[PDB]
Amino acid sequence: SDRFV
Amino acid sequence: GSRFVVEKNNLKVTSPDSIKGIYECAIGNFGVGTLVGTVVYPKSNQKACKSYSDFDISFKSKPGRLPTFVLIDRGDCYFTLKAWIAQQAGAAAILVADSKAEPLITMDTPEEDKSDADYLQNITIPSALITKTLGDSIKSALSGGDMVNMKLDWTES
Numbered sequence: 001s002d003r004f005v
Numbered sequence: 006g007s008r009f010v011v012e013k014n015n016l017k018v019t020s021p022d023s024i025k026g027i028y029e030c031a032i033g034n035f036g037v038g039t040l041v042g043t044v045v046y047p048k049s050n051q052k053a054c055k056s057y058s059d060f061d062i063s064f065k066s067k068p069g070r071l072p073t074f075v076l077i078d079r080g081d082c083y084f085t086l087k088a089w090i091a092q093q094a095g096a097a098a099i100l101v102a103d104s105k106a107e108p109l110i111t112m113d114t115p116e117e118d119k120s121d122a123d124y125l126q127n128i129t130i131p132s133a134l135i136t137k138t139l140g141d142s143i144k145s146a147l148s149g150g151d152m153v154n155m156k157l158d159w160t161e162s
Binding site: 001002003004005 | 006007008009010011034079080081082083084108109110111112113114115
């Protein structure tokens with residue numbers, strides 16, 4: 001569930 | 006898809022009574038005790054992807070008043086840039102409201118170009134991702150004139 005945007 | 010593998014924290018909305026309560030949030034994987042503040046949703050530059058100084062907007066709280074937590078919309082730029090820009094505008098913390106209704110996500114740090122790398126090391130303000138539902142609830146409270154106060158706890162990290 002990691003996101004940059 | 007490890008979709009429930011997020012490091013969750015709790016925050017508390019302390020006012021108004023209509024939305025007071027404990028809510029889950031996800032602390033950003035960057036920056037980083039308890040802090041009480043009051044939430045502001047800007048009328049311009051709502052995704053915090055451009056400098057607030059171009060708008061002559063500052064979130065620095067006046068002496069004797071509560072620190073400002075700025076509510077920012079997800080989208081259009083990296084979460085780390087939103088925190089940096091909110092930090093430059095004097096905000097004491099940033100709440101990024103997810104743009105869709107979904108389980109919380111972890112705001113991760115990107116791999117940046119050489120010329121845009123050093124700011125990642127200089128983010129200090131607490132940053133949390135909150136659900137669309139909570140974001141929408143806070144915006145509705147604010148638009149009716151209520152003060153939204155909030156306590157942040159990052160002791161759980």
